[model samples]
Target: SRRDFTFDLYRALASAAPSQNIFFSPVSISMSLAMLSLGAGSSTKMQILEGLGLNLQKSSEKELHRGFQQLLQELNQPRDGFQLSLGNALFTDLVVDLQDTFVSAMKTLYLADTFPTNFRDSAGAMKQINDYVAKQTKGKIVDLLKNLDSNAVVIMVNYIFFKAKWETSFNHKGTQEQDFYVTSETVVRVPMMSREDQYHYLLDRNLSCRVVGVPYQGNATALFILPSEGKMQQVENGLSEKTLRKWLKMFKKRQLELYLPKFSIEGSYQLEKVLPSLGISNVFTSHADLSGISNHSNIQVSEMVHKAVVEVDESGLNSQRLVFNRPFLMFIVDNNILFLGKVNRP
Candidate 1:
């Protein structure tokens, strides 16, 4: 189910931003929606639960929230191998009569806190919300909300920050400026991290791509799949849970001279226009049921802002010297999908 949401949102992001660098936390976006859907009723609630790529026909709202609660506990468990701060917040208008029950559910279920803000003072409101997200993500996700609709009564923000040490490190001495193929005709020189080591890898002819897995010092692992020459889109279109499971199971460890770009990318998305493709549109319109949030029918979702930041080793195959010299797909996952996206330039 998490896999379904990852691929679904990945495709939508690619469509919204064509052949460009795409990255996002499916967990953050989906959890934020599930939190907000607490206040929704009728089709508004139905579309969100169903559109999350979870296939609600096979899952229920009660199960979805409970699942997320379990997921958060597992992800946020204290550990030294990695650091993760996963959270959400509500920037509510000062005058909006937010339902107590909905607010309590958001706080208790999602580890979220609602802060009342004076939206009439749009500049201050923007500053406070941005400040909160920036603080929550340790400045990695700064400027998630640059501006907001003046009419917005409730602003929801979802942010996830994670840092991990590599099971196998790429020493700084080996990072050198090398050519990276952004496109067939365009290239850029980047500082690429290199190491000669044994790693779990797969060269799959099934999709004509190479898959590489680099485990973090903990339970999580970042998987990179690089398509052959110009088959990037083909690999992307065919990506699914089946493809990933096969790769994970088939991967074999071997000595590898891996060269991965030393780079970091942060993606921020305004998901109002993007989520409609997931069959979730009722919440953004006047004919919506957001009554659980407030008795007033005037309050509805304006936009959902989500941001994910991750850096290098975020990786594959030939001649035993694999160089991630071109655009590639990436995933960071543990028990649930933490983040998934593409890197066109880095």
Candidate 2:
């Protein structure tokens, strides 16, 4: 399942920049990497697959790809009050000459589309790719593709966009500019939202944090974890798939006074460097094999780019005076963690 991969990728990002606000769509990143495996050589393929947290010894490649296929379908299933979409596409340079087998798998296995563009005209290609991602995200993310490599032959693009109303809206009138802690000595002013209602929550004494689940009008929920003063590092270190499951089972229901920040945020990661830390190294170097991807034997992935956008407010959904007044971790989840981040700056 994606649970293992999600946490692994998360910890990697957090470790890289512990002091900054970090956000990303783990599902999209894993899906994009798995998709690239379709065209990799034998050794290269296993690196991308296993490096991404798959239990290859227990599960076959076909099985994992099928899981992603269903994940894409299940994530898009019509829901009552929210919009969640995970989409993928491969933009191949007109000169690449893509293999039909690879193209079919991308379409059938991931429900992704393929576009052939002229890499010689980098700016023009960038515009087209951005337009598609921008539209898919409903304009929440417009310029996801900040720049493109002129020598790129195939660029894998994926976008995950989510929007929902709260199950019980926080009164818009209750929002006021308030203090939010970023570090031990820093405080920032943000529009803090407040509400008092029955909510799914818990206080983990061991972790020294308050966990609150803010349900969307329907199928999604945002779980916010606020570590007590001087305990952020401890709680952050405690994160993992196992820890997450324990917290899920430990959630209790009760009336809570809540205060949350109303904010919009986006993150862009140049994944080429990060992937190597995860053991997915060959794809970005000459050791890669893009023969299956195209007729060209010299081809290798040039870059891996990912960008995500999220906005939370007072609607039927997004709170707490159990209050998230400090730097905290948030997970936007359904069956899986669709989006996750640290609200150090919010």
Candidate 3:
């Protein structure tokens, strides 16, 4: 049974790549947890919080586990999986096994997200996901999903895809004249998209970077941070938790011009190696207190996986903004992989 369940779960997680190109900040605690759970089947404890963003307050570890179990029983669906973002949008796909409970929780979150009272992005996302699952499954998962409490803090989801033509697309149009400076030294001419407008920008000595913020149809926003000097390592090395926190804090409203490129990238990694490299090896070991499911002392996680993709062109850069472009630390409560995938965003 473990093998079949694990295999099925792995297939479902792997299948996420084509549909959802996951991108999360390495240092983002929630993102790290999500990545850790890739391919790993859900435990009963995990099932409860599958789509619910229950804030882990100062509650004790045992209390937290109990609370999670309670929620799972209330909203558990027989053959459904949900990806809900209280801040962004809730996304779901369910089978006929459990539908009623799902609908009620979903509608609760939806009204919470849209109303003037306590609706938030994450709550709105949950509501949307619930409705989507209900429609997509033709009412099969309706009983398992339902409206959530209005007091729940919303989590938003950001789904983005961008395509555009270059302002100066390379063609036989102006093949005669072009020049570019490499660090004020050598000169070369590579096809470049030229555009003129006020853009969000930032600069520093030895290296510079530009900022382009694009909003998705939902509450999510995708920001492109391109290095101006082509010093990928330099820019990546300079990033840190402290630095990133500062960057987000210092982001001021601004304007400038941009000339982005048309590039496509798709990549993945084994988080098993990536996490231990950052000194987070204990949670996956047999000692993990994930007993919320069953009493099995031999319990241990087998894998953590992640993948991502981005496409950019003259219209603008369509990509996921990651916490850092380099490897760093990560955190998770126990076994709940609520947050998954890591990307610095090339």
Candidate 4:
């Protein structure tokens, strides 16, 4: 279920930025929307669920919330030698009173902290929200909110931070400055980490891409898909659960040399426009029925903000020479995607 939805959302986001760098946490976006769905009703609720690719008729509303609660608990559990945090928050106008059931669900199920603020004082509200986000993400994310609408009734926010050591760490001494081709015509010099050892690798003739998997200290693994030159769009357009599975099954352990760039990427989005493009339109409009939240239809979602950051450096395996010289798609997977992005420029 989560896997299917993860690929669906990834495809939607990747399609939006065909030739640029793209990175975001799918779980962060999905979990934030799931929390908001608890307060949604009628068509708004239906649209959110469908957009998330959840079959509401097959799984009742109660079942959906409980499933999300269990998933959140599993993800938030502490792991040895790993730092991963997922945080959600609900900031509402001071005068607005949310339904007791809604508040309880947010606290118990989503583990979200609720705050009452004066939206009219936009600067103060922005600072409070941004400060909380910075603290939760260990300073990797700052200024998450630039401004709040004076009439904004509710703003939902979500963020995720993850750091882990590779099972087979890269040698820092082997890293050097190398040329990375952003495009055939453009080359950028960047710090490239290298290793000469065995690695799990796959060469897909059909896709014309080389796939590599580098594992972490725990169950997670980082996968890179480097398409042939001038074929980045073709490979990206072919992304799907079926293609991902095909690549995973085809990986074979072999001796190879691998050279990858040390890069960090951060992405933020004001989902008011993007969510509607994904079939979630009613909730942001006057026709929205979010009465389940406050028993007042006047309240509508003013914004849904999500911020995610990822860093890849001397963390993983040494390899036989399989250089990532061009743009590629990367995925961090444990049971599901912890993070996914495209590296076009770096």
Report every candidate's CA lDDT. 0.82, 0.81, 0.34, 0.82
After superposition, the stretches of candidate 1 with alpha carbons farther than 4 Å from their true spots are 1-3, 55-60, 313-319
> Could you tell me how far off, in angstroms, the CA of residue 300 lies in candidate 4 after the best superposition?
1.4
* Each prediction's number of clashing residue pairs: 0, 12, 56, 8
Could you give the candidate ranking by TM-score, starting with the highest?
A: 1, 4, 2, 3
| Candidate 4 runs further than 4 Å off | 1-8, 15-18, 316-320
Q: What TM-score fits each model?
A: 0.93, 0.92, 0.41, 0.93
Candidate 3 minimal-lDDT segment of 10 residues: 326-335
Per residue, candidate 3 scores C-alpha lDDT tens digits across 1-346 of 1212212222333344432333432212233243222212435234323422334466653464455345333323232212122221222212112133333433342221111223334456455655654454345333222343433322222221122233233333322323444334555454444343433334434334544443323322344555644554454445433444444455654544333332344334444444443334544555444332223444433343333223443332432222122211111111222222222222
Residue 75 lDDT in candidate 1: 76
Q: How close is candidate 1 to the true structure, as a TM-score?
A: 0.93
Candidate 3 colliding pairs, count: 56
* Model 1 Cα lDDT, one tens digit per residue, 1-346: 3436568778988988886899888777888888888889988998887777565777777887788788877778999876777778888787778888988988887789988888888888898988878787777777778787677877777777788888777888888899999987999999999888888899989789998888898898888888999998888888887778778789999888888888787788878778877778888777778989888857777677777777774321443888999999889878667889899997
Off by over 4 Å in 3: 1-193, 204-219, 228-231, 252-255, 286-289, 314-346
* Model 4 lDDT per residue over 165-283, tens place: 88888899989999899888889898988777777799887878889898888888889889987777777667766777787788899887888888888777777867776778899
